[PDB]
Amino acid sequence: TVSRCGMVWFSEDVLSTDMIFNNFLARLRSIPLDESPMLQIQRDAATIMQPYFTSNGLVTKALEHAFQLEHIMDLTRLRCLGSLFSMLHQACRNVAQYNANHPDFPMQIEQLERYIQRYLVYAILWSLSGDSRLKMRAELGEYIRRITTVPLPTAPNIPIIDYEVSISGEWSPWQAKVPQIEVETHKVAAPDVVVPTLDTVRHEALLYTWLAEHKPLVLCGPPGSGKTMTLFSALRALPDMEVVGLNFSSATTPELLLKTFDHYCEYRRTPNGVVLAPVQLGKWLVLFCDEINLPDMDKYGTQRVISFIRQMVEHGGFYRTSDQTWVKLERIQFVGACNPPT
Ligand SMILES: Nc1ncnc2c1ncn2[C@@H]1O[C@H](COP(=O)(O)OP(=O)(O)OP(=O)(O)O)[C@@H](O)[C@H]1O
């Protein structure tokens, strides 16, 4: 079959990093997040972040070092860049929300610049090295502190990752965000209790950010670490996002996903075409996959189910085999979890 048709090879020199950077910046400057004031705030934010997105810029050096490190899953450059762009989009949404809650005093250019710079640094930290050990995140933080010019927390030993940037554009510790809950006497060691702490509040913010953009994500880490629990707490805390836990097995097939879809969603005919919508209105059906990487590869190194989620995440839809018709996904997003592949 290789010799039965032509060929073209696209190496990874085809997209220079600056190519992706210019695509992201142009798409942000043109299209608005909601679907105009927020386009104006996007333009201002992009004007702020342009100096760090140039060739031989802060993001490029940070990315090459993150490649020099080790990550729990296979590090792909576009994965890091797409995560960073999604989190920057959420930063712009946060600025828009702050403006909406303060009609008298819209956030000025100086505060916007400070917030965007600090969010960019924190975003690099949590996107490039968010899938590494704590020590490797510390190494990346030390590097980026060495090479960047953005002001950073002056904690003598606390790495920047434990810090957060306030909507007022200031470096504030994540510790203050952690409350002190008093669980009831009969609720000790309960299957649902979630004591807030540094890790779960940071992961709460990250889950909120990557779920607002409807970017699917998978939690990685050693068995019994607080991953499934933190995810469920976040998802239940979510206002209008139903949660559908799904225990993927080694015998998992996309047929199971279709079963869940017909159980919770329904097919309706719209002028664009057949559209998948969850039955209950205004709800982002978040399909939790307990063990995303568990399903077996075939003899040709392909997990059919993960191919299905890739198809639906990228193309924004799938094909209904009943009538071989394109079905677009509406109000559906995915989150998974898995221990390291080792
Ligand atoms: N911050 C916390 N507050 C309360 N309990 C916690 C906290 N962090 C972890 N735990 C407890 O530790 C365990 C963490 O479970 P976890 O959510 O990691 O499971 P899991 O994702 O299903 O595991 P696995 O990968 O082995 O299948 C639970 O028993 C949970 O109650």
From Swiss-Prot:
Chain residue ranges for the region called AAA 3: 182-342
Compartments, as annotated in UniProt: Cytoplasm, Cytoskeleton
Protein origin, superkingdom: Eukaryota
Binding site for ATP: 221-228
Subunit structure: Homodimer. The cytoplasmic dynein 1 complex consists of two catalytic heavy chains (HCs) and a number of non-catalytic subunits presented by intermediate chains (ICs), light intermediate chains (LICs) and light chains (LCs); the composition seems to vary in respect to the IC, LIC and LC composition. The heavy chain homodimer serves as a scaffold for the probable homodimeric assembly of the respective non-catalytic subunits. The ICs and LICs bind directly to the HC dimer and dynein LCs assemble on the IC dimer. Interacts with DYNC1LI1; DYNC1LI1 and DYNC1LI2 bind mutually exclusive to DYNC1H1.
Family: Belongs to the dynein heavy chain family.
Disorder noted: Charcot-Marie-Tooth disease, axonal, type 2O: An axonal form of Charcot-Marie-Tooth disease, a disorder of the peripheral nervous system, characterized by progressive weakness and atrophy, initially of the peroneal muscles and later of the distal muscles of the arms. Charcot-Marie-Tooth disease is classified in two main groups on the basis of electrophysiologic properties and histopathology: primary peripheral demyelinating neuropathies (designated CMT1 when they are dominantly inherited) and primary peripheral axonal neuropathies (CMT2).
Comment block on domains: Dynein heavy chains probably consist of an N-terminal stem (which binds cargo and interacts with other dynein components), and the head or motor domain. The motor contains six tandemly-linked AAA domains in the head, which form a ring. A stalk-like structure (formed by two of the coiled coil domains) protrudes between AAA 4 and AAA 5 and terminates in a microtubule-binding site. A seventh domain may also contribute to this ring; it is not clear whether the N-terminus or the C-terminus forms this extra domain.
Function: Cytoplasmic dynein 1 acts as a motor for the intracellular retrograde motility of vesicles and organelles along microtubules. Dynein has ATPase activity; the force-producing power stroke is thought to occur on release of ADP. Plays a role in mitotic spindle assembly and metaphase plate congression.
Name of the protein: Cytoplasmic dynein 1 heavy chain 1
Biological source species: Homo sapiens (Human)
Taxonomy of the source species: Eukaryota, Metazoa, Chordata, Craniata, Vertebrata
